[PDB]
Design a protein around this ligand. Sequence first.
Ligand SMILES: Nc1ncnc2c1ncn2[C@@H]1O[C@H](COP(=O)(O)OP(=O)(O)O)[C@@H](O)[C@H]1O
Ligand SMILES: Nc1ncnc2c1ncn2[C@@H]1O[C@H](COP(=O)(O)OP(=O)(O)O)[C@@H](O)[C@H]1O
Lengths: 249, 249
Amino acid sequence: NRPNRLIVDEAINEDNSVVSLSQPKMDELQLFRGDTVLLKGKKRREAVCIVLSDDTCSDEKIRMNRVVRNNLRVRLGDVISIQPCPDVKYGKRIHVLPIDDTVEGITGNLFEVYLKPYFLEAYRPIRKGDIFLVRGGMRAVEFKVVETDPSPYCIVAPDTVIHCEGEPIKREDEEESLNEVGYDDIGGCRKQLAQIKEMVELPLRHPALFKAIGVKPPRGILLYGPPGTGKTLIARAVANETGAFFFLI
Amino acid sequence: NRPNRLIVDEAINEDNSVVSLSQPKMDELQLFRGDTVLLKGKKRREAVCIVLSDDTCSDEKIRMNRVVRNNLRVRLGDVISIQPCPDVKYGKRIHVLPIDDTVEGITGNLFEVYLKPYFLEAYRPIRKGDIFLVRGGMRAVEFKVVETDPSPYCIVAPDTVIHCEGEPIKREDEEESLNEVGYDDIGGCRKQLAQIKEMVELPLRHPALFKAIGVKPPRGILLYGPPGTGKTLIARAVANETGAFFFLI
Ligand SMILES: Nc1ncnc2c1ncn2[C@@H]1O[C@H](COP(=O)(O)OP(=O)(O)O)[C@@H](O)[C@H]1O
Ligand SMILES: Nc1ncnc2c1ncn2[C@@H]1O[C@H](COP(=O)(O)OP(=O)(O)O)[C@@H](O)[C@H]1O
């Protein structure tokens, strides 16, 4: 019924700001791919990402990762209004600051240890006011973008100068840290975890609905397995990805 | 990269002030052997020792013992700046006082019971301001050198007169006593102990590094074996040789 067409999903393929979108319809939004696209968040936030094709993606939903999801303050199973517009405009020398408690990881040059490989050939569109994650050297850290000269967004190429700061600042507490564990930090591809998803979807992602309708949601759940098999991950990473408050007895 | 070339290591061969140094390069420092050499400590301290050759020493590191190590306030795995200079100048009648609580071991003549065999044919170079250990008669004790006429150091021969004092004085508490147990006081040549070395090297000899890098050092370690097999030695002698504070529950 003229519905937008966007659902949010975990993305198994491993990418910084890349999206899958269904082949059974490519003509409704009609994006050739690699074309800069809108993403509508909450509260007044938006994001920009690159799109690729998957035979094994659903006609239903959209593979996207944890850095895009946290920026938008979208969650799994959520829906974000989306719109294609193809256009993108280049930008300069994007500017960068440490975010939150994390820092001290880099001594001296910090764009040699971090930036060069990731902005290399990627054309990763990078926004004012978002956080992203660079991995390497046995540590991960995130660089906020406070000031970008062109706006609202800029595609990046290595024709531009390199400005440096490197001084930390406290990130807002309302934000959900990217080190707090979530679905991707749980490995094993057991698929059993998908079973806990079906149980905790409605009760703790949709509280008000159960006062409307008589049904019985499950009160308890036992995880069992020998020690070290990830039982505390599952709870931490269900509570983190659904926004519920995790307690610990 | 023009590195000095000195590393500090346990020395299994049994010697008062003798050092092994690698054959794969003898030409870089170029010491024929038996030649007085510098050793650079910390804080402003230095030492002098005699050098010998080992097929089974590494090109990497340097066999030296616990009396030299405590003087320098070097530790195992540490590195001390070193320099050859061949020269040595003779000295007189070196002067000697008891050190720390230990004493009362010798009644009357104390250089008959102690000195004569060890300064005999050795040419042991002996420093102002260091402690060394003489063994015999079911006890061990150490004689500080407060006053030596020639300086900075003197090689000794038995053409000189013998002065005696024998009255104790408190040794500085900051010092690490030579009776406190360490690697050599652990016997058995199990080589298993080498395994505990690999575990406790980085965590407790290099604390600041683990706040820089994400890794998990081991929190607990179980030693097990029937009683009397040296389990309390291992802990005492890991804590003593690494400088960590030993607690006891
Ligand atoms: N299946 C898994 N996938 C990814 N990481 C795991 C897995 N199992 C364990 N880990 C890692 O090892 C630890 C497992 O300990 P824990 O979460 O206490 O498991 P349990 O609750 O079963 O004792 C976690 O900190 C996690 O980082
Ligand atoms: N392998 C060994 N090498 C040298 N000395 C040992 C050894 N095992 C025991 N000893 C000596 O005997 C005692 C062993 O007792 P202890 O250290 O309490 O061992 P455990 O902790 O296994 O009971 C130590 O005081 C030590 O002096």
